Amino acid sequence: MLISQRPTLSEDVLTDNRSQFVIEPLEPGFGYTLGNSLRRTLLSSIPGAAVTSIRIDGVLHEFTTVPGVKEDVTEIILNLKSLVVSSEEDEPVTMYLRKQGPGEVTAGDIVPPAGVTVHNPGMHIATLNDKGKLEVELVVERGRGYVPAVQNRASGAEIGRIPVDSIYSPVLKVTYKVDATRVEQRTDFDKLILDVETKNSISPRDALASAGKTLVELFGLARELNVEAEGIEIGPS
Amino acid sequence: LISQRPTLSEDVLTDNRSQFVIEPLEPGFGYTLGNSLRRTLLSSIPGAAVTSIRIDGVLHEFTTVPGVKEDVTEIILNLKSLVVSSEEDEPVTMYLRKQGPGEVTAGDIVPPAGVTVHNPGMHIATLNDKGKLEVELVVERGRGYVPAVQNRASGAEIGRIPVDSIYSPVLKVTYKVDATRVEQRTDFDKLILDVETKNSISPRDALASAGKTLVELFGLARELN
Amino acid sequence: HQCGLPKLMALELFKPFVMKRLVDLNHAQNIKSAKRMVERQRPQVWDVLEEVIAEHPVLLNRAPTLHRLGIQAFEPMLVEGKAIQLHPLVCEAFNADFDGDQMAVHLPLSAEAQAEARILMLSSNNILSPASGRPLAMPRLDMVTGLYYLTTEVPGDTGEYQPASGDHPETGVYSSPAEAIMAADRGVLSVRAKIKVRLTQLRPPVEIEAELFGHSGWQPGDAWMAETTLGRVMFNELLPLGYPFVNKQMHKKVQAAIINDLAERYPMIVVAQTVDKLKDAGFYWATRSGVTVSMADVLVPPRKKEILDHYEERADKVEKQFQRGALNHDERNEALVEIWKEATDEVGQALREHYPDDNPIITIVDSGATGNFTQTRTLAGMKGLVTNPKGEFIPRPVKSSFREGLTVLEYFINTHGARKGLADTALRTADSGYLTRRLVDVSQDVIVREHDCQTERGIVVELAERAPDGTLIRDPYIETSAYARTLGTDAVDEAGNVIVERGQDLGDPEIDALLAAGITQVKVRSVLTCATSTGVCATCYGRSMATGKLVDIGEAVGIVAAQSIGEPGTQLTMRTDITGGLPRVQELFEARVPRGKAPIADVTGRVRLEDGERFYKITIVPDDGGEEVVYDKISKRQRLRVFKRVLSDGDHVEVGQQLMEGSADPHEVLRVQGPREVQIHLVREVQEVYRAQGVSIHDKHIEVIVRQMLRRVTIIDS
Amino acid sequence: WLSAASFQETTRVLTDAAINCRSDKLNGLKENVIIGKLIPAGTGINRYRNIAVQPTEEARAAA
Amino acid sequence: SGLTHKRRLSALGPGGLSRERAGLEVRDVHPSHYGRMCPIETPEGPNIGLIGSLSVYARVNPFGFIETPYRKVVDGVVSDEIVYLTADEEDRHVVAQANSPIDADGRFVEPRVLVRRKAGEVEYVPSSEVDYMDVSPRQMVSVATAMIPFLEHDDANRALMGANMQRQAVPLVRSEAPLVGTGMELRAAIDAGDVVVAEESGVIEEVSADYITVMHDNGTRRTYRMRKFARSNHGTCANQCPIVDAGDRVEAGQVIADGPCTDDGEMALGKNLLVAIMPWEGHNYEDAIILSNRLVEEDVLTSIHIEEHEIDARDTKLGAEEITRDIPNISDEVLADLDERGIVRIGAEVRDGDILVGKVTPKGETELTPEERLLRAIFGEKAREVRDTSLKVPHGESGKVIGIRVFSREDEDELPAGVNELVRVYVAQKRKISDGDKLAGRHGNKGVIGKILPVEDMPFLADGTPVDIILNTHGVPRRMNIGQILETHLGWCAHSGWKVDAAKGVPDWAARLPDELLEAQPNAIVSTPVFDGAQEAELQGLLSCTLPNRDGDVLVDADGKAMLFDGRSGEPFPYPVTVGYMYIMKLHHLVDDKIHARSTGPYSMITQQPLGGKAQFGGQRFGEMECWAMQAYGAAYTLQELLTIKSDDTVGRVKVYEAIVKGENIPEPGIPESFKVLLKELQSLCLNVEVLSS
Amino acid sequence: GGYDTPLGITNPPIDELLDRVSSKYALVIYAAKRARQINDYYNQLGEGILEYVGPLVEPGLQEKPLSIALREIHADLLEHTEG
Amino acid sequence: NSVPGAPNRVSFAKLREPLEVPGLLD
Ligand SMILES: [Mg+2]
Ligand SMILES: [Zn+2]
């Protein structure tokens, strides 16, 4: 057939990495068809990189405190778990951060190898007091979604490892609500209001574009069964 | 990071039912994908339906035909379950004439070129020796459910009877997923979608029409930049 | 602030406005053809009707209008269909459910009438009840099930915080609620499992904020680590930004305390937006909550046969003792009624111990959403004793639950009490309407005329009597006696420094400061002692309970008092020859001599409890050497008064001491004791009827009525 | 007399309001409803009813 | 409704007590009503107790006393003599209970029997002290109460509501019979009389939709006309449909044609719908109801309502009115569906305001305005000495014209004096279910429809089957009507069918099950009578053995709970939900009758206030309690405008309308006209009331 | 005052309008009299300039004079004296 | 039973009925 009116799309930038998109006027019931698919594709399909596991030297059998630094192991782990990083090679690579003497350890204190870039160099990690020494090896690989702590695969070979949860998704929090537009002269159309919030690794416009791309090929799977089968045409721009 | 791409295959159960299995999906995506496909199948597949009828003795719906056993509202309810697949975009008419004793089935409708009737054993009305049924039916394309378009809106004559139209050729859709959830975090999904239609299209064509609608709609978010 | 108005009703209400607009937009040549377009319902009419309906309030009314929140103004929006769409938060105000109720719609026309509907009676400007100040636009039933489910904490649930060590770290700790929401989208976390999050945009509570952050200043963006569940974080993101983190499980009492605090400390627009957010989250988590009824959820206690056999032996023993002739007919009934009351309590206790904590029946009762446990007991358990057409118990109980199914004779016996309850409900509605009409007519000329009559008179309020062990047990009715009142004298400790000075509103910080400084009594301004010639002043009345501030200088406080008293009719039953329900309130307000009148003493002295022929006669010999006072005709149906033990002969009594047991009459308290002691007597005796049913009225709504009874003097010499 | 006759006992109230030749100053809340003028409460009192509104001097001349 | 209007015992009327003057003691249920009046079925308004209904087995004396039958028991052996006892003789004897056990010849099994003694006492007497027995359980109930399945699990308030709502259900266009019923539905349908019953046995000779002619066993035949599409007294339809084939042999007393609310001869007031007992997003909050759109597309809850409009053309003082097409000045657009005598054509669609019968009355001579005379002189029109008073379709109504009945004076029809012609038009319309309409079940669970969802966003089983109605959980346990839950469980078992595995003997819970209730086919009709029905042990067993659907897929587990999916998000609901088949019915409280509005319409005559009622335009009443709410708010201007220029200020009403239309400010009010009427009545009682200046 | 943007009849917010007056009753008559002056300005606009002035704020597309009056009260463009 | 063409509605009832229901318009 032919659709009643072409839907549009209009961003409304709130902060630097946050937006609010409105898609309207959808057909009746297509707000819930589009909304949950768009939300799960945004939060689970776009690749990114994250820290997989750490090894803090001097901590082998007592995962409570680090000798020298003010924070504890769980505070250091939560600080490294929110480090936004982007990698090119798909293999697990290793980085190191060393800081001697008193002072503050930020995320600009880690030298990355070629291909791996750190995107918030001003993020606080630890505070070194009374001339301590911090030496952490990070492991960064790529993926999608949020995968939890994968346990010790080589338990007898790597005994100092601490696996952390990996937030591979560049987009952090999506919500949607669908409303009504023009019930009177149009008979109860829809209006979907997405609300995307990302890291500073990508922008929410690129997040929505990559989600739309993967959903287009995922439904083209079903479209390429009978290519001459009558759907609903949307018309030119 | 898995590099295997999802593929869709098909298992055919009966002549108007089949199962489609899509795998490997991201962990948590099978339910969402299957419900997008199901919500598009149950609502936006175009078909054809009888739009209005005209019986020759009668003037309104609330009367009886002499000789036939069902009154006119009961004949309307019997014709609501007629599955008909058309091909022309304009409204076409098909005729039904029966004389004398016997049972009027839906295989007594003689349709034009273009439209076929897909259950010739559906019961419509039953007649005795004094009965004669002569009814013409207008077939139109569309989608969804549209109620009876009244005669003052169309400017139609007094004998015409508008009739509710149900154009959807899909009967009953469900799905199920099979998450794996191994210890080494190499998890995926596997969606098994079951589509059952009412003899007017195959489930492959119903799924292809749903996929075409969804690809056109999600092109809009794709062409930002 | 919104209602759904069907478009076919709105087109008829707004017909001249749309005729004017059709002529103005050149859709019609003149008023005659515009009227024809509206009558024939052309397609331009709906496009115009949106324009003329935009931002024009309507008043919605549901009859009977028992208090003033039964008319409220909403901003209409057009709906298809033929039913009005009412917001689910105003149903407690209107007393409306959706089993077939109807509402009336009125249209304000002039600029003053539109301004009154928009400012004075908009629905989001009236959250609190004008009788007690409790919130009325609060979550209820499904929005209480949803928030209680969201905020309960389940031990051993999925992805809980483990403290583990030895081989791996803790693995319950999350770096943000975004990460916790992603983990709950996967199947790894529960919304009711106890975790440790790191919160940056939620304010810590007072102890954590004091410890972690400095002289002041949580200052949004400063990170702290919370030990809570994810559903509590999701609840606390619906509250305002500066509101401290709660970390409790949301019973209906907890939600009402939160909304009272918000209404005291934040603006009205903030309170209305917050209760809409709570409405949304409650409905979502109510449908994701798993509350159903099946017949496998109505569990039956496994000891019910043993309990009922053990009490059947005792009833059989009493019946055989009656058959031997040892005790009469009536004492046998009394023994049987006490036996079966104990059996009903034991069955209910065994049931309550049997049901788990997450049963749907138990959860809907225990969350404060709806219902009570006696309904759960009759549904699963035992119906118990049922009454007669008169009202007395029948000595054979109903031993079947409604899950088992009553028998023929138990069902026929149960219908007597059911029909008497329905007929009494109808009669009680009529009687409460008549009482409200009389109260409106007596107290319609009490309106606020002034700001301060500057009197130095007041009443003394009771405020936490002092324990013998030494502490201040707070008075149980202090929210309806001492809150929302203006202080009349400076409150000092040991004639030292003042704590709360004269003219203060006596809120929660002031009552806490008075009880910390150890003051048991304060003198507050009241409308009983106002010096204003016509009407009352605003300082003596005090705070308006609906707005939380001092009352304005045109308020009709007597109409508000009459509707606050008379709306809690229809839930004032007598009991399970002293009147005790709504007939008790209609005879305190009408100043009648009561049914069971008990005498009061006239003068201090010693007593003469003379036992005459089968009934009493009491004589008081005064300590002043005056003549004796004789109370002659006292039947022995009424028992003697007990205080601390029964009144015996040769005992010392005070000037207002009630001698027998019953209702003292108010006309003799005024003669013997004075005009102050009949105001204490009449206000306390009305509130004892209401407090027995759990109804809150402030005392200032009863003192508006009681002041109008004592306006006059009777002439004893020309 | 006009708010007491409409409460109850209309015939008894009217038959000695006439004998006493009573006069009604229409001060109440119910006598203003019956005869159709503004009740002496709320926004119908002279403090609020006689508010005089005008633009301020700065906003008048700068528009 | 028809059968329960007869068999009604009303205590009020000419010769009996009033309603306001009736005490609270005559509104009670007395222990001598057992078997004579129903304790349950009574009105819930201000007539509770003053109108009742006869019980099922009760008789009436020659003198007017109600009797009830009892089985005579002698020497502890219950015989088969039936004695009809009035309440005095029942007080003299001691009467057992109908479910006390019997040792297959009449002899009691237990040593002591539960009885009913002289004053309403219930005791345990020895088995030879007894001398009567009830003929049945459900002896005490009436006809409409004996059709509530699982009645003894409902409280008496909700049973009273269910019995009273059962006689407000409307006839639907298809009318199917319940899966779980009691046994009363057949006899209440044959005895009500809307069913056509074969008076004498024969063989059906010829069937049409209009008649059935059966040929008896001795030559003679008899034809039975059907009543097709006839208006009942309350607007509904009264169709009759044959259910016999053209060669069928019928017996005497066999149902030969159906009725308004019957299916195959038994009373069928509703439809069986698949229910879920969850809350759902607030749309079923506080007794509202969510429905599928399948019930609108497939015409499940759709009903036909007929209206009748009447006009008559009588003699006046200035001439005779006449019925004609030649009406005064209206266009030829609005004269299109009228035949050549001024009546509508049969089959024509009518809207609100359309001419049905064109009538005109002689007017006489009046003085026309100079403006109107100038307009007549410009456009050339004439005076038109007759005045148009036609019959038009009222506000909010439509339908098709299906029948016209015209009586005339010249054709010797018996019309009243003066009337020369009388015309009746019948306008029938078919109503779908829409929100605002009220539905109920048999257990007192009413509620309006709040939402009609699409099919695809409805909770669905793992089959793919959507549910048809969603009912809220919070309304069940505080009302004590779990008969609806046990009905939902049995309805699922009757829909799906069952098979009890009697391989290693019959299981212990099915020892008292009747044989051939030990298996059932899909869509079996079962019957649980009122105080003798299915026990909870039997419902547990039948839930645990029940047939699969099409694959081996038992969708509803042994608790009666199913796993559902969300129609919008797609994710499965996290806990099992109670599903089953409840029999709901559609009540005659529809929105299209309830809605009214008014801007300006008819006014009264002495006092000039609006008329009241939907049959007029009709204003809403703004009474004393509403005035007190306005005074408590402080809204002097709102209250003044409501009480003057919206009711009574006759010169202010017109200026308000003129000011709204011209766009000006609403003017100031004046004196209401009711105050001037009061002053003239006070003056005419010889009182010198006067208004003073200062 | 930290809240989401008030929509419809709840703009401008009531707790900010009530800082300009002494009671809700004063706000009612204040807004109502200014709305009457705006309506009189619109109706005597065809003839010459008369004693009534305003809107002092820029009105909407088809905005009611009560809404314009409440926005002028909130933006402090008016003054009143009680009786 | 006792109505000549009634549909077969199987009953859960356990007790025999000695007396049939009368005419309900007597
Ligand atoms: Mg109701
Ligand atoms: Zn004072």
Side-chain angles (χ1 to χ4, degrees), chain C residues 62 96-101, chain E residues 446:
Chain C
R62 189 192 163 269
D97 50 353
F98 308 106
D99 53 13
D101 295 20
Chain E
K446 41 171 182 173

Side-chain angles (χ1 to χ4, degrees), chain C residues 116 120 434 437-438 441 444-445 447-450 552-556 559, chain D residues 3-4 6-8 27-31 40-45 47-48:
Chain C
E116 282 162 353
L120 285 182
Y434 182 39
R437 189 171 186 269
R438 283 177 284 172
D441 279 69
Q444 71 175 23
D445 70 273
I447 98 129
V448 175
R449 300 284 185 201
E450 223 177 354
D552 283 323
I553 308 183
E555 263 243 4
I559 314 285
Chain D
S3 68
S6 58
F7 177 43
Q8 75 187 26
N27 283 319
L29 226 52
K30 203 197 284 189
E31 312 111 67
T43 91
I45 63 167
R47 184 195 296 268
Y48 301 134

Side-chain angles (χ1 to χ4, degrees), chain C residues 450 452-455 525-526 529-532 536-541:
Chain C
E450 223 177 354
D452 207 341
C453 73
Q454 264 145 346
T455 189
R525 313 257 292 246
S526 174
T529 62
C530 195
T532 298
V536 299
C537 75
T539 292
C540 283
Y541 188 77

